Paper text:
[name] regulates lysosomal calcium signaling, lipid trafficking, and autophagy-related processes. Loss-of-function [name] mutants cause a neurodegenerative disorder, Mucolipidosis type IV (MLIV). [name] forms a classic tetramer: each subunit contains six transmembrane helices (S1–S6), two pore helices (PH1 and PH2) and a ~30 kD lumenal/extracellular domain. The extensions of S1–S3 (labeled as IS1–IS3), including several basic amino acids, present an unique feature that presumably binds to PtdIns(3,5)P2 in the membrane.
In order to compare the binding sites of PtdIns(3,5)P2 and PtdIns(4,5)P2, we determined the structure of PtdIns(4,5)P2 bound [name] at 3.6 Å resolution. Supporting our proposed inositide binding site, PtdIns(4,5)P2 binds to the same area of [name] as PtdIns(3,5)P2. However, the 3′ phosphate group of PtdIns(3,5)P2 is closer to Y355 than the 4′ phosphate group in the PtdIns(4,5)P2-bound structure. This difference may cause the charge of the tyrosine ring in the PtdIns(4,5)P2-bound structure to be less negative than in the PtdIns(3,5)P2-bound structure, preventing the strong π-cation interaction with R403. From these observations we hypothesize that one potential structural mechanism behind the differential regulation of [name] by PtdIns(4,5)P2 and PtdIns(3,5)P2 may lie in the 3′ phosphate supporting the formation of a π-cation interaction between Y355 and R403. Previous studies showed that PtdIns(4,5)P2 can decrease the ion efflux of [name] by competing with PtdIns(3,5)P2 binding to the channel. This is consistent with our structural observation that PtdIns(3,5)P2 and PtdIns(4,5)P2 bind the same area. PtdIns(4,5)P2 may serve as an agonist blocker on the cell surface, preventing the other lipid agonist from entering the lipid-binding site, therefore keeping the channel inactive. In this manner endogenous [name] is kept relatively inactive at the surface of the cell due to an abundance of PtdIns(4,5)P2.
Author numbering:
A (entry chain D), B (entry chain C), C (entry chain B), D (entry chain A): 38 to 201, 216 to 526
Amino acid sequence: EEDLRRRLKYFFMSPCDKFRAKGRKPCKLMLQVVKILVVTVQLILFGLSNQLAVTFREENTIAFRHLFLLGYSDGADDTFAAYTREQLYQAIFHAVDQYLALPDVSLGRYAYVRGGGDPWTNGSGLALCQRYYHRGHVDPANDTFDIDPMVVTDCIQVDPPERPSSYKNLTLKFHKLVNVTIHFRLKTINLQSLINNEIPDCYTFSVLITFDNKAHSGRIPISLETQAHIQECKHPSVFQHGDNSFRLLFDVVVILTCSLSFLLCARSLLRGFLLQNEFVGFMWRQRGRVISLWERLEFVNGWYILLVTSDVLTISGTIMKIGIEAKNLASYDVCSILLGTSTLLVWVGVIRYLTFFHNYNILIATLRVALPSVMRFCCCVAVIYLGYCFCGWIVLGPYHVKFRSLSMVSECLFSLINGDDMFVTFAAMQAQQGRSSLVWLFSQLYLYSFISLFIYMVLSLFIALITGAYDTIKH
Amino acid sequence: EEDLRRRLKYFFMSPCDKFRAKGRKPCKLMLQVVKILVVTVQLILFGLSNQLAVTFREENTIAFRHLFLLGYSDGADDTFAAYTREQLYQAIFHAVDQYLALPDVSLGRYAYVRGGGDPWTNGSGLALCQRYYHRGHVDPANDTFDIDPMVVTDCIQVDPPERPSSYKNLTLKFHKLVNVTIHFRLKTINLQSLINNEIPDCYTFSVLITFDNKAHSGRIPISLETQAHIQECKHPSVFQHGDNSFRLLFDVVVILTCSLSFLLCARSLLRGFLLQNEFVGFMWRQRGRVISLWERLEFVNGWYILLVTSDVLTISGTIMKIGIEAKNLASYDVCSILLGTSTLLVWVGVIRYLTFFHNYNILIATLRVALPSVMRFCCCVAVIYLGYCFCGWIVLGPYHVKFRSLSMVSECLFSLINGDDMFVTFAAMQAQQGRSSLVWLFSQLYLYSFISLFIYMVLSLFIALITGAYDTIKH
Amino acid sequence: EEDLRRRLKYFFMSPCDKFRAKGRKPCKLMLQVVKILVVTVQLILFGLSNQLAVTFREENTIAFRHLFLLGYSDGADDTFAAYTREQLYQAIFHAVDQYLALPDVSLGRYAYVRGGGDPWTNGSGLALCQRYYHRGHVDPANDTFDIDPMVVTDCIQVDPPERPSSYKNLTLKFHKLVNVTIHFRLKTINLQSLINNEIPDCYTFSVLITFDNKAHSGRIPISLETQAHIQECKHPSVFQHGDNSFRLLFDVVVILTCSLSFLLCARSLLRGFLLQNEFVGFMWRQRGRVISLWERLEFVNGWYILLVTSDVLTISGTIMKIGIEAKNLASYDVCSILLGTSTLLVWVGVIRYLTFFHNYNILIATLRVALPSVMRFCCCVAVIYLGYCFCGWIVLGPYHVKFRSLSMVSECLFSLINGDDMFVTFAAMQAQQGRSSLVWLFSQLYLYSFISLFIYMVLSLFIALITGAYDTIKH
Amino acid sequence: EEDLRRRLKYFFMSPCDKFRAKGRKPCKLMLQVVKILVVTVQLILFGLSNQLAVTFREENTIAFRHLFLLGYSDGADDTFAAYTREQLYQAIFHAVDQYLALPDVSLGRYAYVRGGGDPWTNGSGLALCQRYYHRGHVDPANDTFDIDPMVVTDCIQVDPPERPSSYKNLTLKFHKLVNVTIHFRLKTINLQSLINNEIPDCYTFSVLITFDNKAHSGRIPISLETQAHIQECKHPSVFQHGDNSFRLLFDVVVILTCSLSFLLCARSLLRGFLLQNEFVGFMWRQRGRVISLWERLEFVNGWYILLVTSDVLTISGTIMKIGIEAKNLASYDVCSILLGTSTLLVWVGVIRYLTFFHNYNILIATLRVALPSVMRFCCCVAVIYLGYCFCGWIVLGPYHVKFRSLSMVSECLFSLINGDDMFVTFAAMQAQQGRSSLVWLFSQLYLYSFISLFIYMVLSLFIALITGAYDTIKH
Ligand SMILES: CCCCCCCC(=O)OC[C@H](COP(=O)(O)O[C@@H]1[C@H](O)[C@H](O)[C@@H](OP(=O)(O)O)[C@H](OP(=O)(O)O)[C@H]1O)OC(=O)CCCCCCC
Ligand SMILES: CCCCCCCC(=O)OC[C@H](COP(=O)(O)O[C@@H]1[C@H](O)[C@H](O)[C@@H](OP(=O)(O)O)[C@H](OP(=O)(O)O)[C@H]1O)OC(=O)CCCCCCC
Ligand SMILES: CCCCCCCC(=O)OC[C@H](COP(=O)(O)O[C@@H]1[C@H](O)[C@H](O)[C@@H](OP(=O)(O)O)[C@H](OP(=O)(O)O)[C@H]1O)OC(=O)CCCCCCC
């Protein structure tokens, strides 16, 4: 520390002592405070426009399941099937007879498409199709079965009449069938213009009823899918952009203020790297050996590496959100994560504002001392925790529904050590008590030892590691 | 401490040492003990009269949903709707045909109103009305839509016959409709006079059936509302006030005894302010600087500021409860909070009676040392906790019902760190596993990191702060 | 300690040092070990005979609800009612037509009673009765109502024919009715003689169908009750007492061995009282003042006061269980508590056998040091906990079902601080969000402050009191 | 320690110091690392072939309950019964009429058996049978009942016609019947050859419909059972073993590599026993007395005793899994436990690899110091915990369903101290509030004292034992 006491001990510095040494107003500091009030308000004005366009989308799918499926009651979306050979005829014919008489029984003013796509012809609106094996003759107890898997697509085409036969002659070959699908499209007008007070959207659905039979087990599940394709509709109206000028000028400010904060925060990371040369350069190997890949990262502080990354995640989400004016992108799964994960990192930066206080620093710096010791112990438990996942998946696998796959076993074993759906899993074991009573005896040894290891001892380590790292900050 | 050792060290004083110095019987202390046995008994005699008048009110609404709605089974109050154009005709006509034949199928002896209100005429009892746009012609794929929002109120009036046509000619214009409401009123006699043994009340309901269609999505929810308007009914009977003299003389005692305790407790706050002049006045800036806005509030003790406020909340609730004899106020939401929040503060004052013991003081004064350190750490977590609310609301928003609004996200994320409805949220993510499988991967990173931060570390700080503030009271 | 070092320091004594001083085999100690293996085996042989006689009793009530009630589906035992005036005629007539044709549609071989009781005549088996007000004429909007409460009992009597009219002329006066009940009895033969291999029991039920209308709110709940009256049936068979001699000789051993242990344990309490005279008698007020109501109870040890009481509870339950041979007592609610609470106290006496070990004593004597400090703090919380019960019962009372009475509020507030039915209570508040939106704002302040007081601080005191009383046993 | 400092202090040795003394590459150590990647991949390739063969098995049983049972809706598998004498005729006849017309209404191409088993004749496919008492005449109120238990098996035989009467004359004797069963078998072809691309399996079911009446209580539960008998089906096809050569050569590697690791790990246990002779042999009773059955087990380390046992459990599960090629064994309950429990012990051996680090050893060796003290305290609680099981089973036994047997009481009392199904048990007590109101008062003393003993104190001992054993590893 020969020459640069004025400069190297100005880098390591509390921001409240900036006024005493030289003094300049915090135009560097309060720029990040603006980012709190600019990014959050962007998300609320976008999140309330996404909430409106889903509660209309998911309430046409419910209205499509009652008009197009035979005997649909609420709550049954997985147990709804067809078990006889005459219920599958009555489910296909009811889905078409309600399509050929749609604007006389349904309310909402839907209209047909006269489609010209790939699973349609030149003048069709409905296309029910079959898939089955091209050559097959199976018979149990006379075991000459021949399988050549090649799907045969025998589509049936019918058009909708509006202003005032060849599908009833349908054969399915039930010992050969794979699945029967139904394709049609409907256009509607979103009449939710109370909040917009301007031109609303014009939607175009795509309903897919699937009579899937892949298990070949005498059970055909029936479902319904939609893909709400959204674009503008050609209006003869005028002056839409009187209210459109209140939302697009606000989104380019985020492109500015997060990138204007990307200029200043990254430059502070350049200034921290030039002072690495000034420090070890004049320390000309004086204390033997200086750099051991730990003294270089002292200049690199963990808060500027967070705001630089949070500016990249924000600027990659604002460009995608501009694709709502007229652009033909339909991907809200990517656009919402890039805005959502960035907003998670913007808010946790306020802890740095709470860091420079002498009474909050004790409550935070224990989470930097214990953060190695907690994460070290999490590797001694995630070896044990992966042990009970493979043992429960193959023994309690055929008999129970909760223990079926490792995406579901690791959710039912992790919710059971925190105290939820516990007696439901014990009471489900006793439905197989008389049925193969040795599995029930192993399911009592499995569900008593796993629950009394991660609650009574392993959960009690995480209490003792924080308290053991709380006495070492003031004693 | 020159002159007032007899007086300033009589203010700071344990109440059990009052007898030794001068000595007077505790007519100041035991007045608050009477307030325990006067306010609580007021609430139980009022709470058991409110319980009787609601279990009659909410069991006529259930009886109105079965008589007036077509196909109403229990448990369905949100999934009950109408999806075709003929089920809405059969739901309006069944609600009127059971109104024009009400005293021949229903038990309970209801009677009509012959109403003279604002949505009625001079001689009507039932008024079904429409609302629709005044000028509209929408059509998808021929996109000339014109909207001028102005509700048109085409009410239909019909009267009930009792002693031994123009509504069947109803058209709704389903591509233009907003909502269809139904207004009528019924009067009944509360025959629950077992506990009263005197004149009971006479009610007048107001049933509102709402065929609301605001989403314009092919789904019309059906509901029913009541506002039980309550006043007396003109009796030719005599001597009601033989049992009425057991409840109104007891309520003016609370007006006395809480205000007589407002005279003595506030005067003790005046006496604590005059001794502020006697203390710092004769300390004529002797130790440099005395008052720094912390030494003034030493005279202000936190228990007399609580009982003064609890007397204002009580006296503002006793005046409102007098409006049950003959007054025409109908507001129980304000009257019950003013009594309920006051009773919460009366009971916690008993801790002051448990404060002056040498074995309970250790168990309470740790909650005054740790109360800063817990509340400081709650500000370092409510910044993180508001981070995960915005990230979960826009990503897991369209796909799930629990994560729909911040009034519901902050209830499902807070119940998940205490161990409830945990596996229900994990099993609801896997219904969208094949459907857009990148959201499911983010919902595993979101629901494993949020749950292992506020249970394994942050919940383990609150254990270490109490223990760290429990060793500093006896070591 | 002058004279009785041989005797007073033989009273205070570990039982493993009994062999070294004088020496006698533990016929005093191992008598209590026999009580472990005699009382527990009595309960299992009695508990498995009570389990068999209830699963037959509660599976005739389910079979009676399907044969005698119109439209009874499972799961609905509180929502089952009758809302129109014609459904109450069809529910009474179906309960009688299935009684007059019972042995032709029902399986089980039930038989009639030809009853001679108090609500019957000389030759009747079925008695449907009415109760209504003797003088009443109520009318809303012409408010001259007169009430004279006196029940009029107009019973209708009909007899069952078996070997090959005046009830159809029934009028109920629905604006005057109170309730309509139905009384009959059936006799059956318990054919579950697989485990008995001797004469089984012969039952006589009593079915009570109640069309109760006390609310007068247009809703009549329908229910069914049974009282299975049990005695012997007059058999011409012989040699029942070949298997009866395996269960009554085993129950008089408990009358002996618990009372033979009442002779020795109470005599040890007499011997502890005579040595109180020998101790303070020769201490002739030597150290000033000796007895201060704490030194007398040093001789009284807390384990012999437990086994004496556990012998009284056992001997009062064995006498009652003898009333199953031929005695006409029917009270299993008293007999099972006297056996159950006694068995709870027999098992916790084994801790005394684990007390005399130098490695288990540390784990138990912390529960005698902390047991004052935990119970002192439980009085500082049960004052706060009773505060939130009265505030939640009157504000969240009319709007919600869980917060209806203090027998239910104190179960829903206590299960919410341990982590169960938490999000169910938050999601039930938002069904009244638009309906009177100030109650919903108070229900967020009520259900966030109560849950973050008894989990984050008050639950963290009980961890700090045990740890603070665990360092004071070895440091 | 005279002669063998080179040898006895080479046994006690960290494996990272093996290179410094003599030096050889870890072919002993990394063999166990191969066992991680060989046993786990064996379980995933076997677990995904068991998952496919169960989701076909349990989706034919659902398809059999809708085709063969009258009025079967989903969710009712215990409440489905028959209560009148005409519903049992309509349930037997519907199960046969859908069997004699099975290949005309059902999809899946099932075929009959023409069975030649023990409950069949020479040319039958369906066998409905009766069981009843051979001599019985019971009558209540004329109490001459005679019972001679001997089952009479009156089977009725009928054959299925395919290419284009004596069962309708059936009498059941309902006052004498025991149960009515139905036996038939069906063969189907598993058409799930997408993942196999070769010859699939050929199944043969066995459906058992049971009209069991053992309670004789007017309720006959109806159920359905299957035993999917699996073997090959005689194919005229060729070249199945092109894909079969990818799974059987991988399973004999586990037979090698776990037994090749059984040669080296057991030899290390032989070498630890020869050095017991070298240690105490040259210590010729020098320090008085050496071996006290604690110094012998110092050579026996707890990790080699675990891998030897885990090799026996693995080699006993690989031999059983070979019985899937052509062997006629059908026992997956034994084969999955021998693989599952072995895989649990393979994964926990990785803790030994995390043991030899100076920062993970503190987090693990506390679980060897506290493991006595936790297990000692678990014996002082499992005496109390067995006390509340017998007290709750006989008092809350007849009235409630959750407290019915000790296999269910010990699951509902253990899930209640961890915070699950808590308010469900409190709300179930209040359904018997008016009915025998002294049991309800005892159920509040029972469910408030048991829950505030094992959460507020006993759960707080396990936190204080870990923290008390964490300060004794670094202070
Ligand atoms: C005369 C008009 C009517 C007044 C009738 C008065 C009848 C009588 O005998 O006087 C008592 C009076 C004390 O009452 P005083 O008016 O001062 O009131 C004090 C005041 O209420 C404090 O807040 C009380 O403390 P705490 O909240 O309880 O902790 C305290 O209660 P307690 O100590 O009373 O328990 C009181 O001292 O004496 C004196 O004034 C001091 C000596 C000067 C002599 C004054 C002689 C009157
Ligand atoms: C004679 C009538 C029948 C009595 C048959 C008696 C047969 C015989 O051999 O006498 C033993 C008797 C001791 O029994 P004793 O009647 O005093 O009974 C004592 C009493 O039961 C204590 O409560 C026991 O303590 P603990 O709850 O176990 O902790 C203790 O048990 P234990 O120490 O026995 O284990 C007993 O000392 O001796 C003496 O009286 C003292 C010497 C005076 C000589 C008396 C000679 C009889
Ligand atoms: C010749 C027959 C085939 C044998 C081929 C042998 C090829 C060769 O180079 O010999 C090595 C052999 C050591 O192997 P050795 O048979 O004694 O086996 C030891 C044994 O397996 C221990 O349990 C191992 O400890 P750990 O579980 O790992 O902790 C240890 O492993 P490692 O130390 O090996 O890693 C072994 O020492 O040397 C000696 O015998 C001692 C010197 C005497 C000279 C002996 C010269 C052969």
